[PDB]
Amino acid sequence: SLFELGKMILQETGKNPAKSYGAYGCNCGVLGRGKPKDATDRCCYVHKCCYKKLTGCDPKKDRYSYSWKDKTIVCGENNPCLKELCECDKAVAICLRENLGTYNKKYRYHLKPFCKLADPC
């Protein structure tokens, strides 16, 4: 769910998830997908494509178990769909941290991002 996701993003990036990634570029946010503006934006693109492969479980609503041992995300969930979901969320959190170096505030928006079409997932 959004609780686990936001938590991972905070844990990995050290950033307020909503403020930094709730409306960034074409893919970070709640306005579907678009052609990635940069590395950070591409993380969010991969994340949303990752959601699309899931079988029946709800990425926004369904909770799942994970651990934070040795400052590392560990998906302990036994439920197969929830496990894949957790790995989806873990992967974007790591990807976003990995790309803080090129993070640019100019890609933030308030209404809608100017985007080209995204390649199909």
Binding mask 19-58 for a second copy (x = CB under 8 A): x--xx-----xxxxxx------------------------
- Span 72-101, contacts to a second copy by CB under 8 A: none
58 a catalytic residue: no
Contacts 24+ apart (CB under 8 A), 27-30: 27/118, 29/113
> Which one of a second copy, Cl ion, Zn ion, none is in contact with 47 (Cβ closer than 5 to 8 A by kind)?
Zn ion
4, 12, 13, 17: residue in contact with Cl ion (rule CB under 5 A): 17
For residue 114, which amino acid is it? F
Residue 33 binds which of Zn ion, a second copy, Cl ion, none (CB < 5-8 A, kind-dependent): a second copy
Residues 34-53 binding Zn ion (CB under 5 A) are: 47
Cβ closest to Cl ion, residue 18 vs residue 121: 18
Answer whether 84's CB lies under 8 Å from 76's CB: no
- Reply yes or no on whether 47 is catalytic: yes
Binding site residues, Cl ion, CB under 5 A: 6, 17-18, 30-32, 112
What residues are annotated to the active site?
Answer: 47, 89
